[PDB]
Design a protein around this ligand. Structure first.
Ligand code: GVF
Ligand code: NA
Length: 115
């Protein structure tokens, strides 16, 4: 049960892929590697069951950049059978570190869970 527990949550900007833009999103990282985003913080169970974005951070790559926006981090991960890169930015390097440290820790936990 605590496998589906929330490890970290908060606001961040998700980068456009083919369009230059930053979309505001509220993301929750769960202990089973699920990383889900919403346009606003989910108020209830129903709002939680309808995420706009949903990635798995198992075995991901975590990169940190300052261009074009400072405090940006990139995640290279597997969406089913396709490797994808998603880009996010937060307000401070302190929060970026909280996010990349939380993500890596979860990935390491899933691996060690192959126990
Ligand atoms: O695969 P995801 O990261 O879950 O979703 C994407 C992916 C690509 C999008 O196209 P783009 O507008 O960013 O070029 C894209 O933008 P779009 O579908 O909303 O036009 C995505 O949806 P979202 O960022 O608005 O939630
Ligand atoms: Na689009």
């Amino acid at each position: 049960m605590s496998d589906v527990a929330i490890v970290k949550e908060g606001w961040l900007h998700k980068r456009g892929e083919y369009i230059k833009t930053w979309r505001p999103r509220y993301f929750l990282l769960k202990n089973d590697g699920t990383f889900i985003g919403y346009k606003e913080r989910p108020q209830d169970v129903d709002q939680r069951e309808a995420p706009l974005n949903n990635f798995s951070v198992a075995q991901c790559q975590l990169m940190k950049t300052e261009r074009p926006r400072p405090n940006t981090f990139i995640i290279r991960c597997l969406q089913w059978t396709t490797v994808i890169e998603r880009t996010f930015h937060v307000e401070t390097p302190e929060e970026r570190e909280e996010w990349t440290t939380a993500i890596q820790t979860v990935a390491d936990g899933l691996k060690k869970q192959e126990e």
